[PDB]
Symmetry: C4
Subunit: 42 residues, 4 copies
Amino acid sequence: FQTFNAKFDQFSNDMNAFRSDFQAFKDDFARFNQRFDNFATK
Amino acid sequence: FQTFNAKFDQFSNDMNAFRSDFQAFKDDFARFNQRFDNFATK
Amino acid sequence: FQTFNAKFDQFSNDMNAFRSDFQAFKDDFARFNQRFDNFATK
Amino acid sequence: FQTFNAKFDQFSNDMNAFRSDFQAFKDDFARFNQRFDNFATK
């Protein structure tokens, strides 16, 4: 079980890095969407 | 094991918040894609 | 443990639905990116 | 428990493939965003 737990902790860290990378992309997308809306209005 | 279970419950909540954030982004993307298609047709 | 396992199976299904939703978005994004490249070339 | 562990290992592989697919999309998005910024400046 304690091998499994160490393996789970690594997995959890990987998934939390994934969550963070998605959060970064979501912010980059929001900035793009604002730039698009500015371009399209003009 | 019950330390692990508490840790898992927290992880599950984090992942379900991630799923929700992605769902929000998917909706924002759909709206953008519609606006793009409107702009490009015109 | 078997409560945990049932809980894990539900989580796994939720995560696999999330994976599928992302795959759908990735396809929608690819189609958008092609339409953009067509618009921008013209 | 060892049925569960085998099931977890499969899940972990699925999630790590998901992470990789997202990383690929993030790169594709970055390239698109650069192309957009080039188009919009001109």
